[PDB]
Amino acid sequence: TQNPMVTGTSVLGVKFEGGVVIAADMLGSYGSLARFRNISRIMRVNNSTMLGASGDYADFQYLKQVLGQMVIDEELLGDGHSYSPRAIHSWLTRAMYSRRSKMNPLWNTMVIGGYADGESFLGYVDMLGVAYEAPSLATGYGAYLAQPLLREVLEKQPVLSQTEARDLVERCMRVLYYRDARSYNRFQIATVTEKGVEIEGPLSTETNWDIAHMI
Amino acid sequence: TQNPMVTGTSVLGVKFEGGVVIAADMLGSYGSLARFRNISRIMRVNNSTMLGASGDYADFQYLKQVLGQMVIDEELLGDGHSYSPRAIHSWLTRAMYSRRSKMNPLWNTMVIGGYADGESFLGYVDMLGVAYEAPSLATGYGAYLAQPLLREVLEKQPVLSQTEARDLVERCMRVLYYRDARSYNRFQIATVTEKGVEIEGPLSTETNWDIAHMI
Amino acid sequence: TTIMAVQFDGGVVLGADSRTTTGSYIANRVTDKLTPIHDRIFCCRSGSAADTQAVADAVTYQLGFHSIELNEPPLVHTAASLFKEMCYRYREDLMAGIIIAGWDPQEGGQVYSVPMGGMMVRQSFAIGGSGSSYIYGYVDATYREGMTKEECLQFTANALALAMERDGSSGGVIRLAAIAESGVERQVLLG
Amino acid sequence: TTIMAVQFDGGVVLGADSRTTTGSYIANRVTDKLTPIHDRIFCCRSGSAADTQAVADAVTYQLGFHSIELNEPPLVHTAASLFKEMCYRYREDLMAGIIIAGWDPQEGGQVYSVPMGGMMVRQSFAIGGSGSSYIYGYVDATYREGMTKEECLQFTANALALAMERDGSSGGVIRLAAIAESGVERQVLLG
Amino acid sequence: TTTLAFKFRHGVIVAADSRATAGAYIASQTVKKVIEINPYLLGTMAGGAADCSFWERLLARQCRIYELRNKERISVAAASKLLANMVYQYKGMGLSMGTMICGWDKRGPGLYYVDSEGNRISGATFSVGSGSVYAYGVMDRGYSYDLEVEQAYDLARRAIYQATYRDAYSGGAVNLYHVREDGWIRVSSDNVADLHEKYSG
Amino acid sequence: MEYLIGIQGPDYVLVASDRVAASNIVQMKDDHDKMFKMSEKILLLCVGEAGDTVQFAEYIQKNVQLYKMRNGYELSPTAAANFTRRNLADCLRSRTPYHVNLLLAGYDEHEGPALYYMDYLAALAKAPFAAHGYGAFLTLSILDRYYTPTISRERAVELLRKCLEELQKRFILNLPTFSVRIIDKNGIHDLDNISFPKQ
Amino acid sequence: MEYLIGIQGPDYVLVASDRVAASNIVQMKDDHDKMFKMSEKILLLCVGEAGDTVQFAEYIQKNVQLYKMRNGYELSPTAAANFTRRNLADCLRSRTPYHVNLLLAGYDEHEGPALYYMDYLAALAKAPFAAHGYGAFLTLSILDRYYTPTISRERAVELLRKCLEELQKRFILNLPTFSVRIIDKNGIHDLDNISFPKQ
Amino acid sequence: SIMSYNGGAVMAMKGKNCVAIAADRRFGIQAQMVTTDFQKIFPMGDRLYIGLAGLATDVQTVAQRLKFRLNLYELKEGRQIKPYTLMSMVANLLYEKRFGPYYTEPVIAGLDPKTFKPFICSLDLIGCPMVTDDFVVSGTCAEQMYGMCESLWEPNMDPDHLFETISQAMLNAVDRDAVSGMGVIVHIIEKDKITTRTLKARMD
Amino acid sequence: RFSPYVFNGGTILAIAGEDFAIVASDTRLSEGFSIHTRDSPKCYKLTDKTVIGCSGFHGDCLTLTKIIEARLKMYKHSNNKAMTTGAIAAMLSTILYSRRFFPYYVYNIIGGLDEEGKGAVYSFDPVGSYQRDSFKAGGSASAMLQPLLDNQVGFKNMQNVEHVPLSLDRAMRLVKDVFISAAERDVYTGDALRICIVTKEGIREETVSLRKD
Amino acid sequence: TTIAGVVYKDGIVLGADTRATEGMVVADKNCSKIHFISPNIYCCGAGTAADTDMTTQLISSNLELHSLSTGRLPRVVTANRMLKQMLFRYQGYIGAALVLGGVDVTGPHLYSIYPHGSTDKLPYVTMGSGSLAAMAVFEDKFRPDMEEEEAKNLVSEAIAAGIFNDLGSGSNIDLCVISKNKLDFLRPYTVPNKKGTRLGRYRCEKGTTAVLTEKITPLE
């Protein structure tokens, strides 16, 4: 991929006590035109791991196709083994690194959240094969905008409950609505626990415009 | 002018027995967007000569401003002298040639029609200062499209009456509506005689689409 | 070039202009921009002419061979899947604006969108082409859930006529098609 | 950026979004895109920010000095003539999308258009900006000759809200202004 | 294009061809490439047609005024220097000029070389042109300071003939001037096709 | 840049080259040899790029020797010259073209002496004298002046000395020494080396 | 390309240049002079572009002579050198820059001998020896090897001959002749011309 | 251009029962000549020749590949080749190098092997054949050769006036060209015999 | 972006006679792959003994012609006489060189009578170098006309042909035949042929049609 | 280069011109631009002259192979499908602009083919450089289901409009009339451009050219 046609935008993610919560919006902008304003950008992998992505969307449907097959292919064995969320983060790294070495990359930036064996997991994957783990992640402009709000709380308080974490994302999703030209006031929140993967519906934000009456 | 923003299109013109008839449409296209669909592109100079133009329209309003002043400045003398249509064709040539020599040209292509002393006049002016006379003229794509229809009649019959000439333009304006991507179904016809300059209103064409039922 | 697709309760309604241009000259004054694939599935194409003609013949070859094996009428989602495979694989080589619509026995009317990238999405209504940006704010202020067939024929006719009036690459004549369980009603309109 | 101007029987109605962006980042969340020149003449500006601020201060200096000499209220056509002189002369240097509207004692309501080229034309209604192409087919199917003032405030509010929903460089909050013989009614709207 | 000039005991010999091309197309065969400045100065045309024609005519306009004011002819080193300063003001603007200045002086014979780059140099033998390097071989093998008059005529006429043979941009006739103490004198002008029968035997 | 010369006689071929192997300012080697004995009556002179001279000309060198051992007799100088032209033209429209300039000197028992010319675009020519390099411009008009088809081998060495001293006079490169061969009915004979006391 | 050399002694300055005025292959003039007597104890050596050498150095030549006629006494070699640097640096940021390389040789009655170095970017330096051109690379390490600050003028001509013969050996250009000056308490004296019998 | 790297000129002209063909002799790199005996006209059987012009590499290369295909043709068939058959053979050889093309433009002239009928044609550098009835030309100095042949050609000419026409056409057109000259050779063939003459041209 | 030149075609021919001069040109004005007009002669009567032709970029041909006609009047009120043929050729070289760094794209040939009553032809280049010749052909079809006139007028490459000078009537049919052969092979040539003849009795004009394709 | 076609009430009339140029010099005064395909199908060529020649012979070879194996008359849609699928594989490198026409069992069919592989079925088409001038005559003077001589008059008028535009021809307007049973092919249908006569004496002498070396070789 040399020219991303239909792109998404920033994706957030943060650990908490016993799970990982991830949010992203529902917009398929084409340049500046917000052409596809009802799409899903979060894929529920089997029961513990969970994927959201940014960048080109046609490339995202390709990885949605390939990862969908690999999960089915292990469940048909029935040997009691599944892919850990760290294993998906390992496989996806080698897929991206091999793809840029042919100089024909996949224009994406992906966030992998997972909860297995009582342990949360939150991983980053770049287009160029740069991958790491962190207690809080943000892609796009959210690495410039929402990322300082995430780190200030986690340094002042290292662990978070579920209601604290979910409330904190809605604040950061509000701020991205004010100052990102590719944002949209309709997003969805996905959350892994030990109970499984759950995806909330098309939520919305609440804006303030009292400074408009000022000069 | 290096980049023409708002442009017109082809302008026709043909002599007849005792006058010159000129037609052009009423469209102000911006690239492919037909942004200004009600404008006039034919200027009535004093009583004998008459001007239509193509190319950039903001440059046309400049020459509409300057020529408008020169005609007023001679009428205030009251010495019984006026500019002949050949004199306007001479002046406008030197204005265009001097302008390209500074490498800052006027993006136009202009057709001057005039009737004085029992003689018709029909002159061409290029952006680069190329000027000539002809019994029939066409700018734009009309030099490729409507010009062979003009020359076939004038070689088979050198003189034309007024009803023959006016009918012949409406045929050529019809053909430009079929196969020009910047055309528009609303045009106006201006005509000089010994009675003066007369400009007809926003006329329209009549199209045929019987070949659409064919495969 | 402007193409149009609206589903309703019975089936779908398609529509397009003609005016195949080349630069600023109209090469073809009247053009079938909509193309049959199977008896119930059409597509309307945009972008490069020689590319989209080559793709639509390949999908008709593959889908037409595929239904004779199953001895079943094909799914509309199956047809939209085949355009996605050719466009995503041969991206950086093609400029295709395919919209697939048609009636299905399992699912009724459906409308799918395959833009130049290679993605696929189902929509209630879909437009495309060069002159699609102009009627783009008219269409969602005028759209209303739960139309009849005759309203959708009136809806797309007024929708295409605004871009055809305005866009220089669009215009010509309006070609419409209504696909339902009964048959295919194709008509040529001007107004 | 999307700007709007509609005349009616009494006077004119103006309107714009805010969202001054820079690349893909919004620098200014709320912005007065419409600017007073005299007591009855406004303009709404588009294109480069630093260019159109510099032009509007020069025209206000020239027109404000010009009316004190005549001891008369200025004409709207006089104000639109001054923008044409600066834009045509300093073309290849500026990117200005000026629309001039306002009430006049001699002529009532008027709307003029000065695009990036430097030409000037009077229109019944005029739009402009980057997100102007999207509502561009909505506006001429919805426009109707002989509106009242309250219809035009309803007309431009629905017209701007479609581009503000859609265009990424547009949105924010709606600023409106009604200019008539009586006064100037400015209001800030969201909906 | 091929010119040459050399000085010896009895003055200066100037010779040149007469072919002017335009790309691969021959414009003419009768181009006078030796510009007669004065009855006592000669200049050549090598590289650029109107450039060598204009500035040497402007030099001839200049030396006449010097003669009227000072009641004396200009020296050869002076006329070479005035042409060098006029061209140097247009350095880099794309002039082509490679001429030579010939003439008798109070110091004796005079031979200077002038470029469009500003290479004002003196010397004894020079050869300028596209086929110039074909002339340096045959001339320097036969050159002596103590040549006779008729011997030096045969040397320069041979040297242009060998240059027009190998080079493609050189042909036409072969002009030949002789600079004497009183003034220059035209010697002859021979066609190459006539010299081909003479030299082959 | 470097120099070759090809004086052809009635029953002999006189060839000479230079002995310089410079590197961009300095002159690394002053006794370099550019002469390749293809056979007992055929020489080969090669001027070109830094690597393409040794790689190409040794490929022709060992391939003509294969013809001798396998058939038992020697190639003619005409066929040996016309085999080399086939190898550049085939290897021209490829990712690896050779950029060398050649000239061939041979003696035949049936056809007498022969001289051939070769461009880097692989064009053959049958010439009574030839030269390569930048010094080819200054010198071949001298050789065009005093050439006689019925010339003796003593005059040819003298005409070679006239041809080289003007290259000592008006040529910017140094070029002090010049190796000389001669080919006749007997074989390749080496004449004495030509050097120059300048001043 | 062409060559300059600057051996400085305890009470003398030994300078030498070459005599070549070539044109792109051929060597048009072999007795060219690059030495400019600014005054009775100051020389000037100029190496650069085709036109900028004669135009600039004669501008300095006639301008120092104006100082002599108007004041009645002569410039020092220090001030004369430091006036030239002012003229390049002013004329550098302009549409007409001069591209020449200079070195200055002077004798003072109060300060003894002096040698200065000049770049085309107008940088001054006070050096015990200097050189310009491509031959400056090969030769100045020889001159760095055998230099002694207390050296006699007979050894300096001998050290100059060592410095030039290796440029005759491993330098691609021809350069046969070399003109030599010397400056002492009396004035500019011309030593004999240096030429080379090569082989 | 690459066609202007070595120069060249080939002309053919049809007579009454005979046909003539001519070419120059100069070989040289862009401005420096090398020799004056470069062959550009090659015999392909009896009463049928071919002329080549353009890049001197592809002149010698195509003339050897075409001779390779001709001798295999005239052994699988006992007959000789017809002139139309050679034109179809050459156009096949040029079009195979469609995107790596040889830089030459051939000219074919000859008689019928059975009857007396003359034949002339010329091809492009990718193999578009073109038969005429009066003359064909190729080379760098093409426009000079059109100006002479449009004025001097007559319909039915004996071998005497055919020789004088193509001589005056080649001598006057090539002397106006810079990179062509140094002698002109002329083949005039007919049913009974083949005449080869060389003309007295300007050697400058 | 904006380029200040364009090519318009045309072909100019001049022949210096013994006591006459003939200047001829076609009347086709073209651009690219179009025909602007079929009636645009390139001849211009400067004086009663001098005709100029102008080819190349047509916008410079209209400008340069009007500059020359102004300076003819400036000579005459300052010197009480008309310019000669050789004086105009000397003046034009200064005018063309005056825009050396933004040149006229015009090829010029001046034909006319000298002060002795003989023909004189001066050819030019776009920068202003000139020489006196006996015949020149300028324009687009210049390469198709020079080799033929060398054969007929100059008698080059001919053996045992005497040199009779060109009469007036023989020179007319040479001009009429070279343009028929030129109109077959050149695309920028046709539709008419305007011929001007300068003698000691005035200037005659004559028009011969050509093929119209 | 100007080619055009039309569909009248019974068949198809094709038209072309007779000039091939190189640069801006007329190389050929008579070039056949209407190519044979089958005894019912013909094709007009425009663009690169060698690319149209080699393409129109390959498809004419395969349809002769196909129809002789089938045993019946070919179809125009078969020739369309071969051409548009060949040219798409070369990505428009082969510059060929074609007008395809013929009469099948189904009736007359006219196509226009662009060098990238886009095809159109139309009642009348024009291709080539002078196509804009010829489309003027069609769009002014076409009516459906014309007669025989009415159609031949229209195409000969439309080609002549391109000839008196630039890059026309040394005019020999060609016509190929294809009907259900009768096939016509007319090379000199109209010759409007006549070269004027030569009015000069060009006396050549047997011996006015010097010869250095003669050579005689007999034959049999």
What distance in Å separates residue J116's CA from the closest CA in chain C? 6
- H136 with H145: CB under 8 angstroms? no
Query: C21 contacts in B (CB within 8 Å)?
Result: 181
Residue I81 to residue I79: CA distance in whole angstroms: 6
Q: H/E element holding A13?
A: strand A11-16
Structure tokens at F108: 């035949």
SS3 content of chain D, % helix, strand, coil (to 5): 35, 30, 35
Query: Which of H162, H161, H138, H194 has the alpha carbon at shortest distance from H24?
Result: H138
The beta-carbon neighbor of D168 closest among A182, A209, A211 is: A182
Domains in chain H: how many in total?
1
* Sign of CA pseudo-dihedral F192, F196, G3, G8: positive
User: G79 by DSSP, 3-state: which?
Assistant: helix
Task: Look up tokens 């489309």; give the residue.
Answer: J135
C156 is a catalytic site residue: no
Chain H touches chain C, with at least 3 Cβ pairs below 8 Å, answer no
**Which residue is closest to I180 within chain J, CA to CA?**
J196
H-only helix segments in chain H:
56-76, 83-96, 142-152, 159-176
Q: What are residue I119's phi and psi, to 5 degrees?
A: -70, 155
The residue among H94, I123, D120 whose CA lies nearest residue D111 is D120
Give B148's contacts (C-beta < 8 A, 6+ positions apart).
Answer: J133, J136, J137, J161, J162, J164, J165
Collect all residues of chain H within an 8 Å Cβ-Cβ radius of residue I157. Answer: 168, 171-172, 175
- CATH code of H78's domain: 3.60.20.10
Please report the resolution in angstroms. Answer: 3.3
Q: Residue I202 contacts by C-beta under 8 Å, 6 or more apart in sequence? A: I48
* The dihedral formed by the CA atoms of F106, F108, F114 and F117, expressed in degrees to the nearest 10: -50
Q: Which domain holds residue H14?
A: 1-204
For chain G, the chains sharing at least 3 beta-carbon pairs closer than 8 angstroms are E, F
H193 and J219 Cβ atoms separated by less than 8 Å: yes
Closest residue in chain I to residue J196, using alpha carbons only: I180
- Dihedral angle over CA of F87, F89, F91, F97, nearest 10: 120
Strand partners, A125: A110, A131
Contact list in J for residue H160 (CB cut-off 8 A) is: 206
Name the residue of chain F whose CA is nearest to H38's CA. Answer: F125
| Secondary structure in 3-state letters for F131-192 | EECCHHHHHHHHHHHCCCCCCCHHHHHHHHHHHHHHHHHCCCECCCCEEEEEECCCCEEECC
Which tokens is A63 given?
């990885």
**Does any CB of chain C come closer than 8 Å to the CB of residue B186?**
no
Q: What is the least distance, in Å, from the CA of C26 to any CA of chain B?
A: 5
> Do the chains contact at H32 and E25, CB–CB below 8 Å?
no
Domain ranges of chain G: 1-196
Long-range CB contacts for residues B83-87, cutoff 8 Å, separation at least 24: B83/B45, B83/B46, B83/B49, B84/B48, B84/B49, B84/B114, B84/B116, B85/B48, B85/B49, B85/B50, B85/B112, B85/B113, B85/B114, B85/B115, B85/B116, B85/B121, B85/B123, B86/B114, B86/B121, B86/B123
SS3 D141: helix
- The two tokens of residue F143 are 């050789």
Query: Which residue in H25, H27, H59, H65 has the most chain F C-beta atoms within 10 A of its own C-beta, making it the best mutation to test that interface?
Result: H27
Solving technique: cryo-EM
Which of D137, D158, D166 has its CB closest to that of C134? D137
Helix H159-176, helix H142-152: angle, nearest 10:
150
Whether residue F77 contacts residue F108, with contact meaning beta carbons closer than 8 Å, is answered with: yes
Q: Which residues of A are catalytic?
A: 1
Q: After which residues is chain F broken (C to N over 2.5 A)?
A: none
Calpha distance J39→J27 (Å, rounded): 31
Q: Which two tokens stand for residue C43?
A: 């597509």
D113 neighbourhood in chain B, CB within 8 Å: 36
List beta partners, residue B12: B23, B138
Q: Which of C150, C118, C124, C122 is nearest to C139 (CA)?
A: C124
Distance spanning both ends of chain G, measured CA to CA: 24
Triad C6, C11, C13: Cα angle to 5° = 35
Would you call C168 and B33 a contact, using CB atoms and an 8 Å cutoff? yes
Q: Which of B148, B103, B155 is nearest to B12 (CA)?
A: B148
CA dist., res. B106 & res. D117, Å (int):
13
Nearest to A172 by CA among A12, A5, A3, A9: A12
Show residues of chain D in contact with B37, CB under 8 Å: none
Residues of chain I contacting residue B2, judged by C-beta atoms under 8 Å apart: 1-2
Identify the bridge partners of residue J125 per DSSP, sorted by sequence position: J5
Rounded to a whole number of angstroms, the CA Rg of chain E reads: 16
Rounded-to-integer distance, Cα B152 and Cα H168, Å: 43
DSSP G24-70: TTEE--SS---B---SSSEEEEEEESTTHHHHHHHHHHHHHHHHHHH
Distance CA B33, CA B36 (A): 9
Residue B57: C-alpha distances to residues B26, B37, H37 (Å): 11, 13, 66
Of I1, I8, I59, the CB nearest to B97: I59
**Distance between CA atoms of residues D131 and D137, nearest Å:** 12
H66-H67-H72-H77 Cα dihedral, nearest 10 degrees: 90
As beta bridge partners, residue A20 has A15, A192
The SS3 call for residue G110 is coil
Residue G32, Cα to own-chain centre: how many angstroms? Answer: 14
Consult the annotation and say whether E84 binds a ligand: no
Measure the CA–CA gap between B59 and G72, rounded to whole angstroms.
69
Nearest by CB to D163, which of C137, C162, C166?
Answer: C137
DSSP track, chain J: -EEEEEE-SS-EEEEE---EEETTEEEES----EEE-SSSEEEEEEESHHHHHHHHHHHHHHHHHHHHHHTS---HHHHHHHHHHHHHHTTT-S-EEEEEEEE-SS-EEEEEE-TTS-EEE-SEEEEETTHHHHHHHHHHH--SS--HHHHHHHHHHHHHHHHTSSS--S--EEEEEE-SS-B--EEEEE----PPPP-S-----TT-S-EEE--EEE--
Residue among I30, I174, I210 whose CB faces J200 most closely: I174
Amino acid at A72: I
Distance between CA atoms of residues C130 and C97, nearest Å? 10
Tokens (6 digits) for G149: 């600050």
* Nearest C-alpha neighbor of A57 from the set A112, A126, A6: A6
Answer CATH for F1-196 from 3.90.76.10, 3.60.20.10, 3.30.499.10, 3.30.230.10:
3.60.20.10
Chains A+E touching (3+ CB pairs under 8 Å): no
In chain C, the residue whose alpha carbon lies closest to the alpha carbon of J119 is C50
Residue F71 burial (CB < 10 Å; 0-12/13-18/19+)? exposed
* Phi-psi group of I128: left, alpha or beta (phi > 0 → left; psi -120 to 50 → alpha; rest → beta): left
User: How close is the nearest chain B Cα to the Cα of J204, in Å?
Assistant: 42
CB-based burial label for J148 (10 Å; 0-12, 13-18, 19+): middle
**What are the backbone angles phi and psi of residue B130, rounded to the nearest 5°?**
-95, 120
Residues 6+ apart with CB under 8 A from D174: D15, D16, D17, D157, D160, D161, D164, D188, D189, D190, D191
The string of DSSP codes covering C165-176 is HHBTT--S-EEE
Give the minimum alpha-carbon distance from F50 to chain H in angstroms, rounded to a whole number: 23
